[PDB]
Short mmCIF file of C-alpha atoms in Angstrom, two decimals:
data_model
loop_
_atom_site.label_atom_id
_atom_site.label_comp_id
_atom_site.label_asym_id
_atom_site.label_seq_id
_atom_site.Cartn_x
_atom_site.Cartn_y
_atom_site.Cartn_z
CA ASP A 12 -0.06 -0.08 0.01
CA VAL A 13 1.15 3.54 -0.97
CA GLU A 14 -0.97 6.47 0.20
CA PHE A 15 -0.25 10.13 0.75
CA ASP A 16 -1.98 13.69 1.16
CA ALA A 17 -0.62 16.77 -0.46
CA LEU A 18 -0.57 20.50 -0.69
CA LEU A 19 -0.74 22.04 -4.32
CA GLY A 20 0.22 25.36 -3.78
CA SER A 21 -0.54 28.26 -1.48
CA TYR A 22 -1.21 31.82 -2.42
CA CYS A 23 -0.61 35.34 -1.06
CA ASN A 24 -1.39 38.96 -1.89
CA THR A 25 0.43 42.22 -3.09
CA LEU A 26 -0.57 45.33 -1.46
CA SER A 27 -1.26 48.14 -3.72
CA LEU A 28 1.56 50.52 -2.64
CA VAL A 29 -0.26 53.90 -3.47
CA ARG A 30 1.68 57.13 -3.52
CA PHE A 31 -0.60 60.10 -2.90
CA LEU A 32 0.95 61.89 -6.09
CA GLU A 33 -0.17 59.09 -8.29
CA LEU A 34 -3.75 60.31 -7.43
CA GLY A 35 -5.51 62.84 -9.62
CA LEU A 36 -6.61 64.39 -6.64
CA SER A 37 -3.12 65.89 -5.86
CA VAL A 38 -3.90 69.27 -7.68
CA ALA A 39 -6.36 70.26 -4.80
CA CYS A 40 -3.45 70.33 -2.24
CA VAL A 41 -0.61 72.40 -1.31
CA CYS A 42 1.31 69.49 0.44
CA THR A 43 4.17 71.25 1.91
CA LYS A 44 5.37 69.48 4.93
CA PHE A 45 6.36 70.81 8.74
CA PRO A 46 9.06 68.81 10.61
CA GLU A 47 6.99 70.37 13.54
CA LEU A 48 3.26 71.07 14.00
CA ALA A 49 2.50 69.88 17.50
CA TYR A 50 4.70 72.54 18.98
CA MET A 51 2.65 75.34 17.20
CA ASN A 52 -0.61 77.12 18.07
CA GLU A 53 -2.90 78.71 15.76
CA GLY A 54 -1.32 79.81 12.59
CA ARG A 55 -2.57 82.19 10.04
CA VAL A 56 -2.55 83.39 6.41
CA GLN A 57 -3.04 86.90 5.36
CA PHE A 58 -5.14 88.24 2.40
CA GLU A 59 -5.16 91.59 1.05
CA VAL A 60 -7.87 92.30 -1.57
CA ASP B 22 7.05 74.47 27.07
CA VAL B 23 7.60 75.74 23.64
CA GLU B 24 4.88 77.56 21.42
CA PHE B 25 4.43 79.33 18.18
CA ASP B 26 2.07 81.21 16.31
CA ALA B 27 2.30 81.35 12.62
CA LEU B 28 1.88 83.89 9.81
CA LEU B 29 2.55 81.91 6.53
CA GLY B 30 2.37 83.83 3.34
CA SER B 31 0.93 87.34 2.62
CA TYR B 32 -1.63 87.21 -0.51
CA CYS B 33 -2.35 90.33 -2.64
CA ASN B 34 -4.10 91.18 -5.90
CA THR B 35 -3.00 92.97 -9.13
CA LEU B 36 -5.52 95.42 -10.50
CA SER B 37 -6.82 94.90 -14.07
CA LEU B 38 -5.62 98.33 -15.80
CA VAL B 39 -7.77 98.20 -18.80
CA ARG B 40 -7.21 100.56 -21.51
CA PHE B 41 -10.55 101.58 -23.47
CA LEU B 42 -8.82 101.05 -26.77
CA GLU B 43 -8.16 97.47 -25.87
CA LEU B 44 -12.09 96.90 -25.62
CA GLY B 45 -14.08 95.65 -28.82
CA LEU B 46 -16.77 98.57 -27.65
CA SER B 47 -14.52 101.31 -29.18
CA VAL B 48 -15.64 101.30 -32.72
CA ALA B 49 -18.85 103.24 -31.73
CA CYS B 50 -16.77 106.29 -30.48
CA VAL B 51 -15.15 108.88 -32.33
CA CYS B 52 -12.64 110.06 -29.57
CA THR B 53 -10.53 113.17 -30.24
CA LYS B 54 -9.72 114.81 -26.97
CA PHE B 55 -9.98 118.57 -26.16
CA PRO B 56 -7.37 120.32 -24.18
CA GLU B 57 -10.43 122.59 -23.27
CA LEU B 58 -14.13 122.19 -23.28
CA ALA B 59 -15.01 124.46 -20.32
CA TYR B 60 -14.31 127.54 -22.55
CA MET B 61 -17.12 126.63 -24.75
CA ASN B 62 -20.77 127.39 -25.35
CA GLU B 63 -23.12 125.48 -27.62
CA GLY B 64 -21.10 124.13 -30.46
CA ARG B 65 -22.59 122.60 -33.56
CA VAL B 66 -21.77 119.79 -36.16
CA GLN B 67 -23.46 120.61 -39.54
CA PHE B 68 -24.89 118.14 -41.66
CA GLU B 69 -26.25 118.20 -45.40
CA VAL B 70 -28.77 115.86 -47.16
#
């Protein structure tokens, strides 16, 4: 007598590594980064019309 | 404790200095300038038919 049981392969996934600039929405930002924000209080931007 | 406040950028405008002879309305005028008009009574323009 000869018997066995077998695995025929096992499968994974690949996470879609999405950069933000690959999105078409990246126009609607001005993504300019801080090395510090948690040390800051209320910041401001001045408009003159 | 270390804190901030921020003034990020100061935004202005540019006024639109429209010349009247850059307009498509300026056909309907005949604009010849007077150096004086207040020295003038009723003046006339003649027509012959």
